[PDB]
Amino acid sequence: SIVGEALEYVNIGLSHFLALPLAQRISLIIIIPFIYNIVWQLLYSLRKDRPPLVFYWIPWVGSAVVYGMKPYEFFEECQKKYGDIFSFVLLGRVMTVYLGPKGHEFVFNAKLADVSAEAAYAHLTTPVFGKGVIYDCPNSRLMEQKKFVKGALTKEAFKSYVPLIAEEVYKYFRDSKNFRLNERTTGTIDVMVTQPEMTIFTASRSLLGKEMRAKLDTDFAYLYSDLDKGFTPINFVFPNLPLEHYRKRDHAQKAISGTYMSLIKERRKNNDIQDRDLIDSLMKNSTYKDGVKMTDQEIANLLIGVLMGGQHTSAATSAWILLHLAERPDVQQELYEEQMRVLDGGKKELTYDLLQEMPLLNQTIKETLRMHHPLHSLFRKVMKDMHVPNTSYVIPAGYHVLVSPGYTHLRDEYFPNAHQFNIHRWNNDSASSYSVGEEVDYGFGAISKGVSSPYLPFGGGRHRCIGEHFAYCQLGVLMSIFIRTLKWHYPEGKTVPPPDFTSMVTLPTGPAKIIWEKRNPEQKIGGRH
């Protein structure tokens, strides 16, 4: 009864392995891991403390291809197969999706020890924005940075911004080659060209100030284009490989951040610290509660983060608003009547107050954000094993949880006819969001305690957006002026493009063109150029 007989042949077997032709070693190095993860998945499927894991053929890659291309379709299939909790493998990671209001509650209100937003995002954002801020710092510092940024975003701030944002829109109509309203009465624009430029011009002028706005009329603008391109989903897998767009990214980050510090330091040494923009505001108020101040570099990187995050959400949203209204002249007609009423047929200048008396305009933003959430997925890295309540599931640490409020936005269950663009579903309900009950404060002010609203455009919980009022102000002024100046429609046989999900921001697949006409061909925008 000898067992060695075989253990010898284990050893012999290993030696015949090392000596196979390289033709076959490569083959074996491919077939053996392939077979291994198919065996592992069938085995994983028997654990009852695990959400179902979407089956996948290629290891490591996982379901990345279909997830990246059509994530909402991927969610609906996996939801029909396995229900509202499931996992799937994604470019090296396991994502545990939790669909629906309960998923919102499980992830957005997760405990600070269970999940980390900075662990999921810092690789994507820190090379773009800079160091020491946002996701390159502990959550407590985040909460106080949001407290600083919010302080420049007050109602009195927004009254200053409305005329500046409006001056910027008119100047863009006057001077941009896509309009030139003093020279042409009709034209064709790509909204994916016009809207990003309008967003940065209005955002720069109002948040950063006139100096920073002015710099975008020079070769400097290309640095924002550079810094923009470093903000790419393959920052999320290959974040610092030594290619050149990784360098123009880091150069633009250094160069842009340098410009803000120059202005900051020049204001402190001229004592020229007013209340004109977010730069004055962060200068006067950026000391943490433990007494540490933000450095001028940390302040500037927080500005890059503000402008950059606002840039992509806002520009995509005004692009969808225009594309949706391009086939709804009835809605343009209704929005134009409200403009005429609230503003005495133009004999009243637009103020932040009159903006709040325009519920149908605000309903259009509301509705566009329901059909086109700019972020289809939000993530956390799981730090501690989490038991999914009223199940037997344990999400072990090292997984990621993925919440997707914009998927629920498109469910007939929660929005009758969810795929119709209908601003009237928000009749007497035009608030950008509503704290439907009890509130909580995480460091940056009282926000809703529950995050179980099926309309959750701005998320909830500690990582909840603080830009919604700024975005409504900016989009509000922009669309008010658009509506009062132009009608617009599609070229023959064109309609609303489908969303290009691969940028992770749900942009219209460009080119997305509209044809605009002047409501008053003979009208002239003033000022010099």
Ligand X SMILES: C[C@@H]1CO[C@@](Cn2cncn2)(c2ccc(Oc3ccc(Cl)cc3)cc2Cl)O1
465 is in an annotated binding site: yes
Rounded distance, CA 219 to CA 222, Å?
Answer: 6
Site string for ligand X, 68-107 (x = CB under 6 A): ----------------------------------------
Q: Which helix (H) or strand (E) holds 281?
A: helix 278-284
CB of 458 to ligand X, least distance (A): 8
- Please identify, using beta-carbon distances, which residue of 447 and 486 lies nearer to ligand HEM: 447
CA angle 66, 71, 75 (to 5 degrees): 105
Rounded distance, CA 164 to CA 283, Å?
Answer: 21
- Please identify, using beta-carbon distances, which residue of 38 and 119 lies nearer to ligand X: 119
121 is in an annotated binding site: yes
Give the helix, strand, coil percentages of the chain, each rounded to 5. 50, 10, 35
Rounded distance, CA 70 to CA 13, Å?
Answer: 46
Structural tokens at position 500: 């290009």
Which DSSP symbol is given to 53? B
Work out whether 306 is an interface residue with ligand HEM (CB under 6 A): yes
Site string for ligand X, 457-496 (x = CB under 6 A): --------x-x-----------------------------
Which DSSP symbol is given to 19? T
Sites for ligand X among residues 142-161 (CB under 6 A): 145-146, 149
Q: Between 155-175 and 468-485, two packed helices, what is the crossing angle to 10 degrees?
A: 40
36 is in an annotated binding site: no
- Please identify, using beta-carbon distances, which residue of 246 and 442 lies nearer to ligand HEM: 442
Residues in Cβ contact with 137 at an 8 Å cutoff, skipping those fewer than 6 apart: 118, 145
CB of 289 to ligand X, least distance (A): 15
| 331 within 8 A of 325, measured Cβ to Cβ | yes
380 is in an annotated binding site: yes
Q: Which helix (H) or strand (E) holds 477?
A: helix 468-485
Work out whether 260 is an interface residue with ligand X (CB under 6 A): no
Structural tokens at position 22: 């390289």
Work out whether 256 is an interface residue with ligand X (CB under 6 A): no
| 257 within 8 A of 297, measured Cβ to Cβ | yes
CB of 183 to ligand HEM, least distance (A): 32
Start-to-end Cα distance in the chain? 99
CB atoms within 10 A of CB 167: 15
Cis peptide bond N-terminal to 416, omega within 30: no
Residues in Cβ contact with 41 at an 8 Å cutoff, skipping those fewer than 6 apart: 53, 55, 56
- Please identify, using beta-carbon distances, which residue of 153 and 479 lies nearer to ligand X: 153
Which one of ligand X, ligand HEM, none is in contact with 125 (Cβ closer than 5 to 8 A by kind)?
A: ligand X
Work out whether 255 is an interface residue with ligand HEM (CB under 6 A): no
Q: Which of 78, 99, 142, 358: binder of ligand HEM (CB under 6 A)? A: 142
Site string for ligand HEM, 450-489 (x = CB under 6 A): -------xxx---xxxxx--xx------------------
Sites for ligand X among residues 301-340 (CB under 6 A): 302, 305-306, 309-310, 313
Binding site, annotated residues: 121, 135, 146, 380, 463, 465
Binding site, annotated residues for heme b: 121, 135, 146, 380, 463, 465
Please report, as ranges, the residues that interact with ligand HEM according to CB under 6 A. 117, 142, 146, 306, 309-310, 313-314, 317, 369, 374-375, 378, 457-459, 463-467, 470-471
Binding site, annotated residues for heme: 465
